Symmetry: D2
Subunit: 242 residues, 4 copies
């Protein structure tokens, strides 16, 4: 089963998989042959994920996972090990004024670290892995919205790069995807005058689709992206704010 874009035989964990980008990522990795475990912080979210996966003929499961909790992480990983196997593809997607940036970024990076560490033992044993971190979508127009956005992206890029360096010798790659303005929950806070002003800052002149983030994640998870590590790939239709 030696084929290039295919994830047949691999177990992927996708946190925050119940809507938007997380959902699109879960279906895309499913489409590529992975067994997909999607998580949410509630039972209704976990149920919704399972429904979505069956409806699209993807083998896997919805679980409840709280990335902020050492216990939740340990317990969830164990459950996955007993019933489905070791997740070797892990996609972290779980995660207004200009003074909110610090706690938000700080909290997220502690969660990335917590989860990443837990899954490394299995990736280390298999001498293979993919960790892919999804940045926050640009999430409020104006200046407070830019601050939080640039801050979260700076931290994600630096974190991703450092972790990639730590774990590379084990043939585990660690990358990030940095979305711009995507068509999702944030995008549907949307007066048309401010919308058009927004599309004028994006060279492609449109919002990205959640699928378009999911495609990038899918490539990074593949064997072909094995020499890509420590990278943050921007998926923002040419609109760069930092």
């Amino acid at each position: 089963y030696f084929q290039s874009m295919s994830l047949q035989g691999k177990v992927a964990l996708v946190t925050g998989a119940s809507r938007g980008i997380g959902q699109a990522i879960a279906l895309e990795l499913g489409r590529l042959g992975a067994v997909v475990i999607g998580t949410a912080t509630s039972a209704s979210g976990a149920e919704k994920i399972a429904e979505t996966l069956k409806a699209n003929g993807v083998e896997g499961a919805g679980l409840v996972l709280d990335v902020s909790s050492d216990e939740s992480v340990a317990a969830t990983l164990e459950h996955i090990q007993q019933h489905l196997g070791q997740p070797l593809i892990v996609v972290n997607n779980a995660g207004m004024k200009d003074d909110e940036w610090f706690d938000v970024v700080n909290t997220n990076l502690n969660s990335l670290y917590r989860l990443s560490k837990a899954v490394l033992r299995g990736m280390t044993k298999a001498r293979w892995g993919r960790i892919i971190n999804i940045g926050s979508v640009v999430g409020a127009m104006g200046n407070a919205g830019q601050t939080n956005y640039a801050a979260a992206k700076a931290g994600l890029e630096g974190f991703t790069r450092a972790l990639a360096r730590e774990v590379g010798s084990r043939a585990i790659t660690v990358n990030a995807v940095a979305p711009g303005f995507i068509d999702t929950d944030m995008t549907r806070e949307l007066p048309e005058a401010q919308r058009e002003a927004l599309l004028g800052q994006i060279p492609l002149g449109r919002l990205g689709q959640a699928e378009e983030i999911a495609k990038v994640v899918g490539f990074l998870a593949s064997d072909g992206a094995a020499y890509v590590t420590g990278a943050t790939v921007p998926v923002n239709g040419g609109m760069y704010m930092s």
Copy 2:
């Protein structure tokens, strides 16, 4: 489903190494591939490689430093095969003159192929950086490529043409295979993956960027360096 069926790709510097690998990968994804070299023997060899791997296309002689060569070659392609909507600049070549010259070559060729991409309201331009194997030339060439790529992407985005770059680290190629062992070992010590990349691993990235799924990626430079950043 990641497919380039019906598309004509132009890949400069396609007779060896990374250029070759890119030509085959785009061929593998269904594109009709036109690979170039600066000599006729190179152009012929490219044709032979494409057939040997069951890829439709052609080898042409192209000099990216020459306005005449560029114009003539593009016209040739338009008459016989169609408009190239995927273009991969891999041909390149004192730090100042090297970078300055390369970017003029990127600009020259990019400008020429934009008319056809503009007409089709679709395109992919992908610029391949120089491989590592001195540090000054490398960082300079990368800084220019990144900035160039980002600016061009902004200029042409309204037309649904994306422009991206791929920045290789230490890749296994004809130029690197016989570097002295001291320099090779020093470079492996700076690479977390602890190995050299293959030309195919660059080609896979280029292939994804040429696909429909990378339509919201533009102005990016994707480093492909096994975690070694310089």
Copy 3:
């Protein structure tokens, strides 16, 4: 029992009447920064985590005719920060110039940024009241292990500095960082000649920086002339850039 609080017109003196707080001021770069701000006319409070450090600071300041004090401060502690700042307010005034110079890859960076944030937030009330301030963050000096940690710490410092600058700018408080390369201290002088020469070959200037050369940059950033510089990280590395 050890004590934790130890308290002709030069043309350089442009920070006249300003109180500067310099954490980690007992040796090296922190010391050099304390003297340089002293030389520019500021009243300087240098800190260390021990009483002997705090005493050494006071002795250095007096020996160079700089008014100020050595205090004991633990930037990791909310209590220490609150207490120290109160003490400074009662006895010397509001510090309007603040220079932060005080699995490992993650905890180091994470811890430091929480310390920066803790201290920065505490001093902002006084800067806000005065409608003027300078916060300057000193990165770690360079030193597989030592490049990863270095680039990580620098990426965090840059992003942190830039965000904080955006948050506080409306109040005419600037927030900048200085990112040292290979600086000449006790530890780099005592390297074997072969490794030292290999290091100097990676630095275009072909030498190690002096602590004073970091201090000069910090001094300019603290001045009125750097009032439109904010959110910047100034590299001071003799041309040697590690990403």
Copy 4:
């Protein structure tokens, strides 16, 4: 410290940022040669320098021309001495602008390196374009940063530093006449909530020219009140 005993060359010195840089280096004790592309500009520069008690001169220089550069440098060498502080502020779609400017920086920088090499000391400082669209601005900045960094690496062994200053929205002739809608929109994107003054660029240039900035090389210092594009 000061620049007593040093000859500084400042291209584009007749108005705005270039003028402010000329006066600031003058104030710090340098002998200042300011250039412009016209004779009236050159005259104006001389008048400004005398009015502020700065020793020096106004010359006509075209940085795009090998002949103009060679001739001007020779003239400076005969009459005033070797310029060891050089500030490139003269500049000028996106591709040709940036390409042209960097060739100008390279042309001029190369010409002044012989004298800096002979003295074993030098300062080259490149001033970026003031914001005024975002594409041209980011492109020009990316090139300036990369150029500055490469040149710094080439010449560092000689104790010559090479740095750049990247202005954000500065108060100048070109920005005074901007409509008060675009103005207010720009102030809202600048944390300091104001435009920079030309003097504030000049102060940074002055520090970089000093002995205290001797370990700073290859840097681009942004002077944009916190507004980063």
